[PDB]
Amino acid sequence: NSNICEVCNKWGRLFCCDTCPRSFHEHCHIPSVEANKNPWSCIFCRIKTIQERCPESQSGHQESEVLMRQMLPEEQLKCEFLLLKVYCDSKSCFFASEPYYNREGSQGPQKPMWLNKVKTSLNEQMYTRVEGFVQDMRLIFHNHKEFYREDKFTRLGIQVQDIFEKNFRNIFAIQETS
Ligand SMILES: [Zn+2]
Ligand SMILES: [Zn+2]
Ligand SMILES: [Zn+2]
Incomplete structure (x- = not known):
């Protein structure tokens, strides 16, 4: 070991x-x-x-079909693993815990989201379909892009979203495209 x-x-x-x-x-x-x-x-x-x-x-699968799947045990497991793959990257520290927003020229998101909240939501079986989990995951990075504007810190959101997306395509066997 x-x-x-x-x-x-x-x-x-x-x-x-x-x-x-x-x-x-x-x-x-x-x-x-x-x-x-x-x-x-x-x-x-x-x-x-x-x-x-x-x-x-x-x-290969279509993303649209994957997102509509009910969270039966195997899809629950795959979302858990995809979440774990994001936490494997050290840059996930920025997105783990509950954010706060006080930056001149920016307003906080309407719906804050963070990895530990998604973790709890999975643990408590709050998502009925894959779409619910993927939407909250993508919201984390979208909130970050919007808030940090032209600050170069925005790139952290791009980087960790790229990890999420690669692993989503891998775990759920999304059809490869150009
Ligand atoms: Zn093992
Ligand atoms: Zn078989
Ligand atoms: Zn550890």
Whole structure:
């Protein structure tokens, strides 16, 4: 097993996966690492098993169809993993916790949004369809672009959105296009 957390790359109190070498802090894993369960398989392993059970699930899909899917267990898992893939990037620190807005020449967004809120919303089964989760994720970066205007800090939103989008296309097997 690895000696650092797969998500935040720090050591500490780690839980080790039984079917791959990854390790996690308790609340870095999504869902939070489960109390008992021996053996325990991490989210990377669980996502791999889905693909292996249904190889055809990797054929291309239309985003419109993906977004309308109900949040049954497999889609819940895939959103959890996509969220985890965003937290894996260190630049997600900017978007994790509840923002506040007081900048000359800018007004705060009408609907603030942040990663820990999406995390809670997933944990509490508040999204009925994939679209709900994706909309809140995209709102995080859209709010940031709008607020920071021409400050070069806007680029952090572009960068972390790019990570989200690449992973969304990968996890949900979106049809590749030019
Ligand atoms: Zn961690
Ligand atoms: Zn694993
Ligand atoms: Zn099959």
